[PDB]
Design a protein around this ligand. Structure first.
Ligand SMILES: O=C(O)[C@H]1O[C@@H](O)[C@H](O)[C@@H](O)[C@@H]1O
Length: 304
């Protein structure tokens, strides 16, 4: 048994939808391989913060990782491109993009950087939360200090809004907010909840400026050393976990919103997003640098 073992990393805790997703993938891969293939999940950043685990996965030290496109920065340039603000209209839109040929194009981009993309997971939309004041309009962000994920595109996004970005690993955000070093950060409801940030940043504004895709990626080095039979099992188990993870995600979006609101989170709803969207013009100008990227963005916006 467990002749083929794979260590899989996630920054999130046990019980979180992405972790439950890979745990389901692991149960299925074990069943389908008659006990041969054994995926072990290491949650809560046990093996390191997310960007660091991505690099260790590329080197084959970690076998598999569940990660946000936003943690890649320049490592996979099209991953950064798909982290542009207000690129996707909805979770349905994003599903149709990632499920179609654009998803295959991105898979090729990951493979060129020694990562085999076997599933795309849902991460919903990200919105601003802070400890200082309600954000009711773009102008309220002026001069404020917000953590972002470690990609240049998010630093530029904050500058476009007249604020100051500070990239840092997810695990350090809570203390930085708590001690007042930064004013806030931005994320989806389940992160805002499970991270504890709602305890130290009670103001949340549903500006929904990002929908950053996520993936399960296997080390290409480890993958290439597997038999075709074992590769087939992994891909099957990964694809099976996708609809499952999507449903777990939808349920947790609801539960976490309810939870944090029950705890006193002060939420601003119905914000006019138009000025937020307009402000992103320079960001698109800076990152949409080609034909290859221009047409990509175009085909995304054209996807129903
Ligand atoms: O802000 C972050 O770093 C985290 O945001 C969450 O939404 C992602 O699911 C996670 O992969 C990122 O590490």
């Amino acid at each position: 048994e467990c002749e083929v073992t794979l260590r899989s990393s996630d920054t999130h805790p046990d019980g979180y939808p992405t972790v439950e997703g890979v745990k389901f993938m692991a149960e299925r891969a074990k069943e389908l391989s008659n006990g041969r293939i054994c995926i072990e999940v290491f949650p809560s950043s046990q093996l390191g913060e997310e960007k660091d685990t991505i690099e260790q996965t590329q080197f084959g030290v970690i076998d598999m990782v569940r990660a946000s496109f936003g943690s890649f920065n320049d490592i996979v340039p099209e991953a950064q491109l798909l982290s542009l603000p207000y690129l996707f209209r909805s979770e349905e839109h994003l599903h149709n993009v990632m499920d179609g040929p654009i998803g295959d194009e991105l898979a090729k981009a990951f493979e060129a950087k020694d990562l085999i993309a076997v599933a795309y997971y849902d991460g919903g939309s990200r919105s601003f939360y802070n400890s200082q004041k309600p954000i009711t309009k773009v102008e309220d962000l002026k001069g404020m200090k917000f953590r972002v994920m470690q990609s240049d595109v998010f630093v530029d996004m904050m500058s476009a809004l007249g604020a100051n970005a500070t990239p840092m690993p997810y695990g350090e955000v809570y203390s930085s907010i708590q001690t007042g070093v930064i004013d806030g950060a931005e994320n989806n409801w389940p992160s805002y909840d499970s991270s504890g940030h709602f305890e130290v940043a009670k103001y949340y504004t549903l500006d929904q400026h990002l929908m950053v895709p996520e993936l399960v990626a296997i080390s290409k080095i480890k993958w290439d050393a597997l038999s075709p039979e074992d590769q087939q099992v992994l891909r099957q188990a990964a694809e099976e976990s996708e609809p499952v993870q999507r449903k777990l995600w939808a349920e947790q979006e609801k539960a976490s919103e309810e939870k944090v609101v029950a705890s006193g989170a002060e939420v601003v709803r119905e914000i006019d997003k138009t000025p937020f969207i307009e402000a992103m013009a320079p960001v698109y100008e800076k990152y949409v640098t080609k034909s290859e990227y221009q047409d990509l963005v175009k085909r995304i916006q054209e996807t129903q």
